[PDB]
Design an enzyme around this catalytic site. Structure first.
Site, PDB file in Angstrom:
ATOM      1  N   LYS A 163     -31.534  20.437  34.385  1.00  0.00           N
ATOM      2  CA  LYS A 163     -32.945  20.216  34.684  1.00  0.00           C
ATOM      3  C   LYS A 163     -33.539  19.224  33.682  1.00  0.00           C
ATOM      4  CE  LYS A 163     -33.380  24.792  36.893  1.00  0.00           C
ATOM      5  NZ  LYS A 163     -31.944  25.108  36.631  1.00  0.00           N
ATOM      6  N   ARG A 206     -24.340  19.944  35.861  1.00  0.00           N
ATOM      7  CA  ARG A 206     -24.658  21.312  36.230  1.00  0.00           C
ATOM      8  C   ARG A 206     -23.783  22.326  35.488  1.00  0.00           C
ATOM      9  NH1 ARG A 206     -28.026  20.103  40.579  1.00  0.00           N
ATOM     10  NH2 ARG A 206     -28.458  22.302  41.008  1.00  0.00           N
ATOM     11  N   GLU A 239      -8.380  29.542  29.558  1.00  0.00           N
ATOM     12  CA  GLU A 239      -9.077  30.817  29.470  1.00  0.00           C
ATOM     13  C   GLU A 239      -9.011  31.383  28.056  1.00  0.00           C
ATOM     14  OE1 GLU A 239      -7.343  33.275  32.409  1.00  0.00           O
ATOM     15  OE2 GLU A 239      -8.527  32.410  34.050  1.00  0.00           O
ATOM     16  N   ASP A 277     -35.141  32.976  29.469  1.00  0.00           N
ATOM     17  CA  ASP A 277     -34.472  32.061  30.386  1.00  0.00           C
ATOM     18  C   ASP A 277     -35.301  30.788  30.387  1.00  0.00           C
ATOM     19  OD1 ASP A 277     -33.265  30.614  32.375  1.00  0.00           O
ATOM     20  OD2 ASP A 277     -33.204  32.264  33.821  1.00  0.00           O
ATOM     21  N   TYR A 315      -6.289  24.583  32.500  1.00  0.00           N
ATOM     22  CA  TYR A 315      -6.637  25.989  32.330  1.00  0.00           C
ATOM     23  C   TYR A 315      -6.676  26.314  30.842  1.00  0.00           C
ATOM     24  CZ  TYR A 315      -7.261  28.710  36.608  1.00  0.00           C
ATOM     25  OH  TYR A 315      -7.778  29.276  37.756  1.00  0.00           O
ATOM     26  N   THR A 367     -29.921  26.397  31.952  1.00  0.00           N
ATOM     27  CA  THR A 367     -29.077  25.431  32.621  1.00  0.00           C
ATOM     28  C   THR A 367     -29.121  24.120  31.851  1.00  0.00           C
ATOM     29  OG1 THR A 367     -30.885  24.730  34.052  1.00  0.00           O
ATOM     30  CG2 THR A 367     -29.482  26.503  34.841  1.00  0.00           C
TER      31      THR A 367
END
Ligand SMILES: Nc1nc2c(c(=O)[nH]1)N(C=O)[C@@H](CNc1ccc(C(=O)N[C@@H](CCC(=O)O)C(=O)O)cc1)CN2
Ligand SMILES: Nc1nc2c(c(=O)[nH]1)N(C=O)[C@@H](CNc1ccc(C(=O)N[C@@H](CCC(=O)O)C(=O)O)cc1)CN2
Ligand SMILES: Cc1ncc(COP(=O)(O)O)c(/C=N/CC(=O)O)c1O
Ligand SMILES: Cc1ncc(COP(=O)(O)O)c(/C=N/CC(=O)O)c1O
Lengths: 453, 462
Positions: free
Chosen positions: A238, A244, A56, A209, A54, A235
């Site tokens: 692709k 991902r 954050e 985008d 973790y 992303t």
């Protein structure tokens, strides 16, 4: 129990399923334009102890202890992202924590807009993405059309190109606060400068985008949206050939100062997301480094050539292409004039190990039963396919479509169509014969990743 | 270039960082309550070719071709989740596509509520999560307080327990459409039956966010929220010991019987939940994460896991007992689950200072808010959890030694606090003062020599 047992020993059911999928990827003509084959190096970071942490917050400003190593990984990913796209760190920042592409876009909207503020994107059937504010006549579909007020712009139906003149007309009346330039199923390049003109006239932010074309942008084989955009999302799985994940680029420094950075970072965390996925961040950094090499330009150049060769082959077999060709990695085939729908085409081809997706075309009203078929070059180009290999792919496809057309002439409803393919002995034999030739052709090529999973 | 080269050969700069983090996990006392050490088997599925597949939709109804195998994986993951929590498939369904816990909760609200509908959660400084509607006096912090209207419920500051009476009072006036039962920093068990009573009176849905306790629930070592809740969300990477992901459970089947027609009235959660996850909020499912979760869920149905979860309870209780013997204050006075919340304000030290000193000694925790705290960046507390070190075979006596090290580090921190003023000075002093740095280096060596002797789940080197 140690937690150190291998997957094959401790969960043979799951391990079999993994091999089955790896074999499926190896034996097929994988033509889904949004898929690629991730390198083993990135996959090794994706499946690592980084899952356990973790962290954050942002580097040097975390809400947990023990973050000194993941701080350097996140900082390294940020630097590699800027380098990959040839960006001056004094002019651009990047946030590398979005879990995927859809969370990245939602964070941009949440950062810059109030609830019910106005956005404009390309309509889905015209080639825009779900998260670009898509709602239909009957129903708000994307949450980006629920929490924000969306109006689409459209293609010129005669040409299949974005109607920039109609976009400008409607933007003056609708007054969006943000306009999205980015597509999921558009085979041409976007005039980002013209988009900038419209945004400047109505005082809208320009979000690009570039999810689909990001690898081509990094290789500098097509024009860069960073010249004109205020915000850029993408992303990493692709054309960038990574794990991902999502990325948000934003302008910083003096505009005439920019105030994107604090709002973008706050919207990602704490506003929308929880703990970052450090294993994905690390896997993204690995793929970004690969994208800086001359090898990657060569690959991206081959992606363009292979898609053009595919389009040329389809055109000479009498197929209809939306916009009449391609300038990027994908082609959108309108099967309506051929008398077959996308759902039936996708099913027949899938049975002979040709993997694509049905796709809406301009004028379609159902995405479940649309009139088109989207095909992309990136995944098979990563297996060293060349132009002549894609001309062969198009032979196999025509052959499957003709089977689909014959089954359609003998059946009425879609359920009848699907059953006939499995029960008719004559059709089943032609299907298997074609399947064997496809799989024998595909298995000969190399495949990135691990060897068996 | 093949794409088959190892990470160590093609990117040594990244591989070195991976090994440094692996070694950091092995050498330290990792006490962050929301962390755990994932097994190698799950990690092998996480780093797989499943990363490459687009499969939007649900099994049988996909938007892409080629989904035959991921269909089987997604269905298997759903079945193992139902089996892991002993759920009847005729009364419960599960959605296994949420990317993490915060996306899971946001999907539930989007599925069941209109924009600006009302929710009630436990206030953050009182132990509730960010995604339970958290907004401060000065700004709206979580997007769950921007797109929906929230009102917090609170703890009885006398006892440190949830004030169920005050919740009932305020909920009648506020009229929430959904009440969230679940916590991030609460050491006691939630009275779900009392939660359900409030919800029934005001006609609200009951969402149980069991992220922190889900592994304990699966092992049946604490009472299950499934008996009273309408919807249940959880993560898979805390006490469930899996990859980072989320799950949504929802009731299905018959809710009531129409007394005149004699016919069943069904639950209507399934279609709304599934639609909210996709196409409304998410895009492509992360199939590698789904497969890794299915691996972890199978591990949770074993007797080994029950013993593990029982040991987590014993270790957390022994640690609470030891902290109490040494003069420390615990919010609510102890624990009935996997974590303890230490209020350091009576000792005159803040959470940010304590986190730092322990971190320099390879004791990894997190600063945390306590009831009455106004800042999360500089809170009054420290949260400690047993799951991660219990995965390394720690037993109760080992956690007693952990508290000894913690007390030593805290005492060094109080000394530095008396010698400094601002947080940047306290912090600089820990690296500048030769004496202090030598005390820290001495404590660190002992800590790491103790921690390295225990086994570690996962790969051996990354
Ligand atoms: N142009 C474009 N093509 C794309 C996508 C996209 O976002 N844009 N996709 C994105 O990655 C995939 C398809 N995803 C989609 C899924 C659902 C709906 C949709 O509108 N669903 C509605 C209506 C269904 C119907 O009746 O046909 C629903 O679920 O109710 C659209 C696209 C692949 N092709
Ligand atoms: N009770 C509780 N403890 C928790 C969490 C939680 O959600 N609830 N966390 C969740 O995983 C972690 C901490 N995450 C948090 C991050 C930001 C803020 C917050 O309020 N940030 C504001 C104000 C900061 C300040 O000035 O102190 C901001 O960033 O503007 C709170 C908790 C660990 N402890
Ligand atoms: C322009 C654009 N933007 C965002 C996304 C969302 O990416 P995720 O699926 O949320 O990782 C996509 C996905 N596209 C999936 C496809 O086209 O098959 C996209 O084409
Ligand atoms: C009850 C509850 N619900 C949801 C989440 C979000 O989980 P993600 O971080 O989005 O995977 C959390 C995370 N908590 C992180 C922590 O406690 O340190 C939680 O305690």
């Amino acid at each position: 129990w140690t937690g150190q047992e291998s997957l094959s020993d401790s969960d043979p059911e799951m391990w079999e399923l993994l091999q089955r999928e790896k074999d499926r990827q190896c034996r097929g003509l994988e033509l889904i334009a949004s898929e690629n084959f991730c390198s083993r190096a990135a996959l090794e970071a994706l499946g690592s102890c980084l899952n356990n942490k973790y962290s954050e917050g942002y580097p040097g400003k975390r809400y947990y202890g023990g973050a000194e190593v993941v701080d350097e990984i996140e900082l390294l990913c940020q630097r590699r992202a800027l380098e990959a796209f040839d960006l001056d760190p004094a002019q651009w920042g990047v946030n590398v924590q979005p879990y995927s592409g859809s969370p990245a876009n939602l964070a941009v909207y949440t950062a810059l807009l109030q609830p019910h503020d106005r956005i404009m994107g390309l309509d889905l059937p015209d080639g825009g993405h779900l998260t670009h504010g898509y709602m239909s006549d009957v129903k708000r579909i994307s949450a980006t059309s629920i929490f924000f007020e969306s109006m689409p712009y459209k293609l010129n139906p005669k040409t299949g190109l974005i109607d920039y003149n109609q976009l400008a007309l409607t933007a003056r009346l609708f007054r969006p606060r943000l306009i999205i330039a980015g597509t999921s199923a558009y085979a041409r390049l976007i005039d980002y400068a013209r988009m900038r003109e419209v945004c400047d006239e109505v005082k809208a932010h320009l979000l690009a985008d570039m999810a689909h074309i990001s690898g081509l942008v990094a290789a500098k084989v097509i024009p860069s949206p960073f010249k004109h955009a205020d915000i850029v999302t993408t992303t990493t799985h692709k054309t960038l050939r990574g794990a991902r994940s999502g990325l948000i680029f934003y302008r910083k420094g003096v505009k005439a100062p920019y105030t994107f950075e604090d709002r973008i970072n706050f919207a990602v965390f704490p506003s929308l997301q929880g703990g970052p996925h450090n294993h994905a961040i690390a896997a993204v950094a690995v793929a970004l480094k690969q994208a800086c090499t001359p090898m990657f330009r060569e690959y991206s150049l081959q992606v363009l050539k292979n898609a053009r060769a595919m389009a040329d082959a389809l055109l000479e077999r009498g197929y209809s292409l939306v916009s009449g060709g391609t300038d990027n990695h994908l082609v959108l085939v309108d099967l309506r004039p051929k008398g077959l729908d996308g759902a039936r085409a996708e099913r027949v081809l899938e049975l002979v190990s040709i993997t694509a997706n049905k796709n809406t075309c301009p004028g379609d009203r159902s995405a479940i039963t649309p009139g088109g078929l989207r095909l992309g070059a990136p995944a098979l180009t990563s297996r060293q396919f060349r132009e002549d290999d894609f001309r062969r792919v198009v032979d196999f496809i025509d052959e499957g479509v003709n089977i689909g057309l014959e089954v359609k002439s003998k059946t009425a409803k879609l359920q009848d169509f699907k059953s006939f393919l499995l029960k008719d002995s004559e059709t089943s034999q032609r299907l298997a014969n074609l399947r064997q030739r496809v799989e024998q052709f595909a298995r000969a090529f190399p495949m990135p990743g691990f060897d068996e999973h």
